[PDB]
Design a protein around this nucleic acid. Structure first.
Ligand SMILES: Nc1nc2c(ncn2[C@@H]2O[C@H](COP(=O)(O)OP(=O)(O)OP(=O)(O)O)[C@@H](O)[C@H]2O)c(=O)[nH]1
Ligand SMILES: [Mg+2]
Lengths: 423, 40, 153, 526, 157, 484, 39
RNA sequence: AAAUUAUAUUAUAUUAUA
């Protein structure tokens, strides 16, 4: 008959204890009465429950999304007329987005570095023990025998390292043989990926298959192979004007004596020109992305205000947005001394364009204050779409000036881009 | 008309750049959930 | 590079002017004594502005993360947005106080109507030869207006 | 290329020169050209990327003439130049550290501590990064990889990142699984354990490996280090609402966490027991929470569920009190009055049955004398004030007495019957004298400790107000609804007038006293 | 900021009452004030001024000025009384410049009153000792001001 | 795909709010359906339920302290019973006949509910009510435009009439002051009347409070009233208002004047029954009504227009404007306010800021696109402390809790009643994005929240559902590639 | 364009995923909705 | 029989008959 005002759950009691601690600490905004703290706690618990309800209804709505054209589901995207106008990426755009690396490649690189360091330590141990010089004859090269047999390396790995599995020890023996022969190159594994055993014709001969793989790997990483691949890709029309200009500049840097010394070799005078093109040709291992510009922040050190500009119609609409960080989370936007809901006459389709640079940045609008000064033609009302376009460009340039990495999504949404249309 | 003065970034107006990292992390989470389903 | 761009150098100068503004020092300067319309008329509207505290949801959302979650909520200028780089965390991140009389600029329209007519009518209401220090103060002022048909002439 | 025209100045930035120099640095095959390229890269103004640190650490680890201190100095130079360490560079440095034994042991331990700090910072960074995406499976794999990296280094993850990771979880299964991971990270894999078949887990005995001083302080015990994570799991089970495809009950989850805590031999702290029986106090099962509060009270009175009675338990009871004021207050506020189990213990052995729907005066008199004997033998009011525990927390005992009298007066809990039916008149007279005794004890406690700020909270005051309201409703239903029977009717009217006078006094005191904090109780009941 | 119409529609082909199109002289435009300037049929001094753009623009400027004047005068809840310098309150004991002469003057920056003196409006009930010394009967009652520190319904009591 | 709509059964209809459900084919993806498994006659029992339910229809006695910042509903029969006058200026914009009748229970609503609860027995708690009002006769509620002023006035009229208290409700004060026409009072010299508003008030107050007005005996009322053949002389106050408003024109024009005069006379004498008086827009009753005094040449009489020294036919002129205190209704109201012998009438009123905008310049309003066509032409500032004898209560805009609850009720109970998106739920964004965006667009102003909830239809720059459908279609394609 | 041999070289040390500033190709597009089938 | 060059937008006109 009488509802108890006291906190009824442990979550309610914990939030009430937090509100009491905030009131005893003297924080600005925390109420001093107990009924207001009770109202605060009940409303926060109801807000948490409503957030959980929204999350659960989005989980259910994800599975019933009409992905096909149906009764109420219309394309209307120009997918019939133009076709696939919206892009989509499966890679994190660096350095705006972050996806953690997969554990398989991490463990593979970890094990490869472990085996390489162990083989290098065993090679240096034999170099200290044997006493210096070690010449390999032609028959010793054809027999492919180094200073250590496989049995000696296996006995050393069994004696020094007790905790060592069988296949790991055999891979260690193989890598020690590969490191004592030459410096180790990780080229046989990728050639095993791209070239199968049935293609060359060795199905019952694994040893000759791995011998051919390591021979092709040691012949692949030479300078002449890279030069021949660069010339082949130059013949296959894989260059732009930028690569042609950089090859011309690298040709102009060579003098005549260096040209004669490079043409003494058969492949180096082409390689000095085509080094950058062979870097480009080598794929995702060695070709870099261009990427959007990431500048430095131009912020007032005293007030914390960044300045951005926006234009529309060339002469008619000019705007300058001043942006500051609001630390009390009461952010508001103002255009020429009047709040945004009264400048644009409460029109949602005009103020959503001003909200959009905060949306594409994944930023909260309440953490920022903004004032937009009109420098173009003064009119009694700017409630139109072109003025809102200029406002969006001004707010986006101010956000770019404040935080520099905000230029990575905001340029991709086209909000920093100026069109030239006049009347 | 002829929209040649309009930039190429304004004609499709590709918005929604905030959701891509969330989609990629959700894809990685679903791959690990499928790996958990296949093992048990 | 330099520090700011052309419009950014303009509005950082307007904040240094209003920081040292004193209305009795605007004696005979003319329209150069008008104290930066945006920040001046904002101060005249403090009877209407009345800077509110942070809302009860905001101070609850922070204090849960400060105390119950052991991970403080940091400002958007404190977020290390670059993956692969550590930023030198500039000092204006959370030290700027949020006051409505300072920023953002919202004013009464009647004060803005009175400001804009007073600034143009007092254009040549300037006392040039004042008994003062250097380049402002003098005893006689000569202005030689040269005119020609070309700008490089 | 240094730009000269403004068109190529519009495509110039040092953050894009980072990618250009990264691609050219990966294009090289050997470290002598790579170090020259890096030197002319860092001489120029160029933002140093994580890719630069990755390719430099990897292709300097595999170079032949490299000493490992130059690898760690190169890492220090790159992190000084503004490059964030990732898991790849951390694992590269861990591999270079593991393959270096010719360096002196102080250098190895310094680099080991640096890698421990680096792995903990990366773990906290990934916890803060993958939190809002609800990536609990991916974050679970990342934390498993970090645990595997740190157990190989002879350490474990810190309890601070464990408290944060438990506070950012969403599912209860991975919550209990990560408490299991923290319990197993301290002990080796051959440690004895106990099997929980409800969760299909094995929780190990942790007190044999925890540090202990056996004058002595609280921070010298490792039991605080484990009970911090236990408290983080308990508070997460309080505040957050878990989302599961088949959601478990709160009683089952609390009992599984309680057996997970009790099967380890860790020494219990104050606020952990307080939070646990706070969860017991606001539970919805009327037939269960009595035994739950009894079990957590036994845990707080013993202090540890270890099988042997050690001197470390006596040192822990001498340092801090697990039987503090909050646990006695929440125990009295959690118990049922008409429970036939005894409220207080007898020689710490068991809480026996009562010697007698019996709602007589002698029953509740034995209950109240048992409550007062419990408050006397625990000694929670005689404890000295300190920094960690204030004087304000001892008012919770009076709140527990007030909720006990509330559950006597009305029949219901927090979630035409105006009171509990089936009572007698002398029951309500004894209840009114108990309200007066609680008010007198609270006034005496405030008068004794006036020199520090001691206030009564909302729950005790509202409980006393609703007991007086229930007594008022009983009086007005017995007076004009009693059928004009003469059996000490003037005693009923005297009790009614005393209830009205004390209630109006409490309402005017809630309006005036304590700085107007309880103004809403004046606004509601008047 | 105002969203009302200020300019006149230009001269073109004779419009018809269609969708997104109103005739050039309609009773809906400008409150029907185009009724003075319209021709109902589908003397040169009375026909040429209805088709001139500067004439109709001057007429709609006059009508918008009349609307601005009546809305500025309907805002007035006061009147200007010439009070001598001695009996005036302390904020008006200064040298007040004329309109558009100086910077818009704050009321009292020392007493934390940052507001325009020209927009200050004083109550009639506080100046009865100045405006009415001859009555002596207190023609207006004193203004009841609420106690801000009193425990009321606003403060949960 | 997964519909779960053919398996969905309707829950049993208890009140009007439960009956406001649309067919299941409408809100199938708007309000998604979940499945639960209970343990009755088997381990699985597939029960398909809705994620969202309607807010509970609650009696004002059942509203409590824990319902602050929550949403409740009132029945349509209770809406007809308790409000025959109408509602506020913009309160009924959110209640079509299909929609539930929802109300947000704010903190000030709880304060005024406990105040009205103490008004119901005022002679015992007279010192408490004096301490609440600070000795004043009542409360005046002020704030910016579009807040919960008139909504709280309808809420306290609901609170007062649900507890059987005689309640005066003026749902809009602009029908009195800014009315159609003004007529001089028949029996009050120098006073004026708004006849149509008085006829509507004498009808609706009588049919609202017939339960207590029939037991109201006429104390100071003449018994020689003019009465047609077959009509009964009034012996009750309800009979008096039935004599007043039920008449043939033009006899009702003077009958309403006599009825308002004697009704305000009969109200001023009752000192034992509590009478709550709720006026929406007291700031219009505190200044001049928009009527002006007639020119004296109208009443003087003319022989001709050429030689009579008059200009009523030549030039217009603005005569002095009639104040509100010269209306007999507001005369009786101010007579009850200023005379201190009435510790019985509680004036829980508010102001209105419904006026047209003016920001330095003003052109002419466009007749097609004008949100302020029915707005008041006043432009005058108002101060409730200086211009009213009541205690002022300041209501601001919504905090995020009340705004979240109100927007959740609006969106979900519009889609549940078959008035929202429905099958087109996949085109609009989810609730968190809608809450963020409407909190930007409105500034949590409640009228702005309603206006931007209606303006959510024309949002152009939301790209959430597009990227979500791209991701789901890509996931479906790679799942079919995994299946192959 | 035409088929070439670029990217077909074996990358040294297998660290082609940790280079996050690598070339990501031209931006591909995806359908937002499956159009109805022709037959 | 495809590619689309296609501008497209809306209104008017006569000795009704003087
Ligand atoms: N149901 C309900 N609606 C509310 C509540 N508060 C605000 N509203 C909405 O807010 C809008 C504003 O209502 P009003 O009270 O008439 O606005 P106002 O403050 O009087 O604005 P003016 O008339 O200009 O003074 C209404 O249309 C309601 O839909 C509430 O508590 N319950
Ligand atoms: Mg209103």
């Amino acid at each position: 008959m009488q509802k108890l005002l006291s906190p009824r759950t442990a979550r309610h009691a914990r939030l009430f204890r937090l509100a009491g601690k905030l009131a005893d600490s003297g924080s600005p905004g925390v109420p001093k009465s107990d009924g207001e703290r009770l109202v605060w706690v009940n409303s926060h618990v109801r807000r948490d429950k409503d957030i959980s309800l929204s999350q659960e209804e989005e989980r259910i709505r994800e599975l019933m999304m009409p992905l096909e054209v149906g009764e109420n589901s219309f394309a209307a995207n120009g997918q019939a007329t133009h076709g696939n106008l919206f892009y989509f990426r499966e890679y994190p755009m660096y350095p705006g987005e972050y996806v953690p690396a997969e554990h398989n490649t991490l463990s593979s690189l970890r094990d490869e570095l472990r085996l390489d360091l162990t083989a290098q330590s065993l090679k240096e141990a034999w170099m200290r023990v044997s006493g210096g010089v070690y010449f390999q004859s032609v028959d010793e090269y054809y027999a492919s025998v180094d200073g250590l047999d496989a049995e000696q390396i296996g006995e050393v790995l069994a004696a020094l390292f007790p905790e060592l599995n069988c296949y790991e020890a055999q891979a260690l023996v193989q890598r020690t043989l590969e490191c004592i022969s030459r410096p180790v190159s990780a080229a046989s594994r990728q050639l095993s990926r791209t070239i199968t055993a049935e293609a060359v014709g060795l199905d019952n001969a694994p040893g000759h298959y791995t011998n051919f793989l390591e021979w092709m790997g040691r012949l692949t990483e030479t300078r002449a192979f890279k030069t021949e691949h660069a010339l082949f890709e130059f013949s296959r029309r894989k260059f732009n004007r930028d690569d042609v200009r950089v090859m011309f500049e690298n040709y102009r840097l060579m003098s005549k004596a260096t040209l004669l010394a490079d043409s003494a070799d058969s492949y180096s005078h082409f390689y000095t020109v085509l080094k950058d093109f062979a870097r480009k040709v080598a794929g995702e291992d060695s070709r870099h992305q261009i990427g959007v510009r990431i500048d430095e922040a131009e912020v007032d050190p005293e007030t914390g205000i960044a300045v951005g500009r926006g234009c529309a119609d060339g002469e008619k609409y000019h705007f300058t947005a001043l942006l500051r960080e609001n630390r009390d989370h009461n952010g508001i936007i103002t255009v020429m001394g009047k709040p945004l809901s009264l400048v644009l006459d409460n029109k949602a389709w005009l103020m959503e364009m001003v909200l959009m640079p905060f949306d594409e940045a994944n930023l909260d609008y309440r953490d920022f204050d903004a004032h937009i000064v009109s420098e173009g033609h003064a009119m009694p009302s700017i409630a139109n779409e072109i003025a809102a376009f200029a406002l969006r460009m001004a707010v986006a340039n101010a956000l770019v000036k404040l935080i520099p990495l905000t230029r990575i999504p905001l340029k991709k949404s086209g909000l920093l881009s100026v069109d030239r249309r006049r009347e | 008309d002829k929209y040649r003065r309009v930039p190429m970034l304004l004609k499709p107006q590709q918005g929604g750049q905030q959701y891509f990292n969330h989609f990629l992390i959700r894809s990685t989470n679903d791959r690990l959930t499928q790996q958990d389903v296949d093992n048990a | 590079f330099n520090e700011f761009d052309a419009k950014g150098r303009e509005y950082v100068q307007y904040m240094r002017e209003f920081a040292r503004f004193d209305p009795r020092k605007s004696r005979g300067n003319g329209q150069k004594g008008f104290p930066f319309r945006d920040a001046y008329l904002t101060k005249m509207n403090e009877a209407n502005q009345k800077t509110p505290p942070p809302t009860l949801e905001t101070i609850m959302d922070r204090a849960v993360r400060e105390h119950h979650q052991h991970a403080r909520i940091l400002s958007p200028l404190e977020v290390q947005r670059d993956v692969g780089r550590l930023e030198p965390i500039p000092s204006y991140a959370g030290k700027i106080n949020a006051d409505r009389s300072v920023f953002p600029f919202q004013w009464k329209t009647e004060d803005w109507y009175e400001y804009e007519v007073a600034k143009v009518r007092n254009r040549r209401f300037v006392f040039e030869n004042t008994e003062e220090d250097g380049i402002r103060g003098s005893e006689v002022t000569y202005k030689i207006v040269l005119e020609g048909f070309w700008d490089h002439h | 290329l240094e730009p000269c025209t403004p068109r190529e100045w519009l495509q110039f930035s040092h953050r894009n020169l980072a990618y250009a120099y990264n691609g050219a640095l990966r294009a090289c095959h050997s470290l002598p050209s790579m170090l020259l390229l890096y030197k002319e890269m860092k001489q120029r103004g160029v933002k140093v990327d994580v890719d630069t640190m990755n390719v430099l650490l990897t292709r300097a680890a595999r170079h032949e003439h490299i000493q490992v201190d130059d690898v760690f100095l190169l890492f220090d130079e790159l992190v000084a130049l503004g490059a964030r360490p990732d898991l790849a560079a951390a694992e590269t440095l861990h591999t270079v550290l593991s393959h270096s034994a010719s360096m002196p042991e102080e250098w190895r331990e310094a680099r080991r501590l640096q890698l421990v700090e680096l792995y903990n910072n990366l773990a906290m960074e990934e916890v803060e990064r993958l939190a809002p995406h609800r990536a609990d499976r991916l974050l679970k794999e990342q934390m498993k990889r970090f645990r595997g990296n740190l157990q190989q280094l002879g350490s474990g993850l810190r309890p601070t990142v464990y408290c944060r990771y438990l506070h950012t979880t969403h599912t209860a299964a991975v919550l209990l699984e990560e408490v299991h991971n923290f319990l197993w990270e301290l002990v080796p894999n051959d440690h004895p354990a106990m099997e929980i078949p409800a969760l299909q887990l094995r929780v190990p005995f942790v007190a044999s490996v925890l540090r202990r001083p056996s004058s002595v302080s609280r921070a010298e015990f490792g039991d605080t280090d484990v009970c911090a994570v236990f408290l983080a799991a308990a508070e997460r089970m309080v505040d957050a609402d878990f989302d599961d495809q088949r959601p478990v009950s709160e009683r089952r989850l609390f009992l599984s966490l309680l057996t997970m805590i009790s099967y380890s031999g860790v020494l219990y702290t104050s606020d952990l027991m307080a939070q646990l029986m706070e969860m017991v106090k606001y539970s919805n099962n009327d037939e269960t929470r009595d035994s739950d509060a009894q079990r957590v009270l036994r845990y707080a009175l013993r202090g540890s569920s270890a099988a042997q009675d050690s001197a470390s338990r006596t040192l822990w009871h001498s340092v801090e009190k697990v039987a503090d004021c909050r646990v006695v207050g929440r125990y009295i506020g959690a118990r049922n009055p008409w429970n036939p189990i005894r409220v207080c213990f007898d020689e710490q052995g068991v809480f026996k049955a009562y010697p007698i729907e019996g709602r007589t005066l002698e029953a509740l008199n034995m209950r109240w004398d048992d409550v007062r004997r419990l408050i006397e033998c625990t000694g929670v009011l005689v404890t000295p004030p300190s920094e960690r525990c204030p004087q304000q927390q001892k008012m919770e005992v009076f709140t527990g007495m007030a909720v006990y009298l509330r559950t006597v007066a009305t029949g219901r809990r927090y979630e035409g019957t105006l009171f509990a039916e089936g009572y007698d008149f002398d029951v309500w007279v004894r209840l009114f004298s108990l309200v007066q005794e609680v008010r007198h004890d609270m006034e005496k406690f405030m008068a004794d400790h006036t020199l520090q700020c001691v206030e009564p909270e909302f729950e005790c005051w509202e409980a006393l107000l609703v007991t007086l309201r229930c007594a008022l409703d009983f009086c007005v239903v017995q007076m004009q609804g009693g059928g004009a029977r003469g059996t000490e009717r003037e005693v009923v009217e005297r009790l009614f007038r005393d209830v009205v006078a004390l209630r109006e006094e409490l309402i005017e005191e809630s309006r005036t006293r304590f700085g107007g904090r309880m103004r809403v109780l004046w606004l509601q009941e008047a | 900021v105002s969203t009302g119409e200020f300019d006149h529609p230009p001269f073109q082909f004779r419009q018809r009452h269609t969708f997104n199109t109103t005739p050039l002289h309609d009773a809906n435009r400008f409150g029907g004030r185009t009724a003075y300037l319209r021709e109902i049929g589908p003397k040169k001094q009375g026909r040429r001024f209805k088709k001139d753009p500067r004439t109709v623009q001057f007429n709609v400027d006059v009508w918008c000025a009349q609307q601005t004047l009546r809305k500025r005068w309907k805002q007035r809840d006061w009147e200007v009384i010439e009070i001598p310098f001695r009996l005036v309150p302390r904020e008006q004991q200064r040298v007040i410049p004329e309109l558009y002469t100086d910077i818009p003057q704050m009321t009292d920056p020392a007493r934390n009153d940052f507001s325009n003196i020209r927009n200050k409006v004083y109550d009639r009930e506080e100046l009865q000792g100045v405006l009415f010394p001859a009555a002596g009967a207190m023609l207006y009652p004193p203004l009841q001001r609420v106690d801000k520190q009193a425990m009321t319904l606003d403060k949960y009591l | 795909k997964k519909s779960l709509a053919a398996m969905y059964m309707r829950p049993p209809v208890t009140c009007y709010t439960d009956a406001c459900e649309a067919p299941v084919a409408m809100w199938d993806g708007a309000i998604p359906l979940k499945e639960t498994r209970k343990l009755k006659n088997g381990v699985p029992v597939r029960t398909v339920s809705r994620t969202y339910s309607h807010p509970p229809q609650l009696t004002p006695t059942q509203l409590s302290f824990n319902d602050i910042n929550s949403m409740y509903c009132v029945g349509n029969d209770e809406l007809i019973q308790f409000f025959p006058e109408g509602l506020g200026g913009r309160v009924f914009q959110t209640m079509p006949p299909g929609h539930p009748r929802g109300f947000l229970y704010r903190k000030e609503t709880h304060l005024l509910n406990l105040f009205v609860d103490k008004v119901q027995h005022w002679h015992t708690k007279r010192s408490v009510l004096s301490s609440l009002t600070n000795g004043r006769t009542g409360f005046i509620v002020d704030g910016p435009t579009g807040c919960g002023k008139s909504a709280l006035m309808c809420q306290v009229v609901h609170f007062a009439r649900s507890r059987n208290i005689v309640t005066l409700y003026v749902p809009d004060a602009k029908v009195w002051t800014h009315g159609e026409w003004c007529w001089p009072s028949t029996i009050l010299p120098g006073f004026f009347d708004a006849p149509d508003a008085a006829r509507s008030f004498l009808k609706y107050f009588a049919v609202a409070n017939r339960a207590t007005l029939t037991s109201w005996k006429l104390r100071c009322t003449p018994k020689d009233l003019p009465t047609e053949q077959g009509e009964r002389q009034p012996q009750n106050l309800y009979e008096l208002c039935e004599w007043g408003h039920r008449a043939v024109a033009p006899a009702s024009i003077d009958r309403q004047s006599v009825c308002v005069k004697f009704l305000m006379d009969e109200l001023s004498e009752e000192k034992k029954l509590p009478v709550v008086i709720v006026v929406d827009g007291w700031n219009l009753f505190s200044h001049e009504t928009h009527f002006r005094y007639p020119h004296p040449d109208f009443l003087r009489g003319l022989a001709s227009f050429n030689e009579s020294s008059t200009d009523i036919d030549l030039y217009p002129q603005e005569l002095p404007r009639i104040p509100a205190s010269r209306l007999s209704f507001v005369r009786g109201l101010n007579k009850m306010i200023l005379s201190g012998d009435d510790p019985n009438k509680f004036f829980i009123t508010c102001t209105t800021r419904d006026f047209k905008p003016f920001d330095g310049i003003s052109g002419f309003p466009n007749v097609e696109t004008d949100r302020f066509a029915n707005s008041l032409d006043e432009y005058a500032p108002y101060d409730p402390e200086k211009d009213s004898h009541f205690h002022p209560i300041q209501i601001g805009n919504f905090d995020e809790y009340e705004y979240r609850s109100f927007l959740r009720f609006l969106i979900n109970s519009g889609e549940l009643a078959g008035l929202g998106w429905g099958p087109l739920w996949h085109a609009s964004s989810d609730f968190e994005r809608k809450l963020y965006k409407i909190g930007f667009l409105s500034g949590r102003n409640p009228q702005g929240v309603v206006d931007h909830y209606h303006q959510e239809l024309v949002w152009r720059y939301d790209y959430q559902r597009t990227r979500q459908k791209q991701y789901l279609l890509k996931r479906r394609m790679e799942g079919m590639s995994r299946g192959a | 364009g035409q088929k070439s041999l670029m990217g077909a070289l074996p990358a040294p040390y297998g660290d082609a995923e940790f280079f996050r500033g690598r070339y990501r190709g031209p931006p591909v597009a995806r359908p937002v909705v499956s159009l109805p089938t022709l037959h």
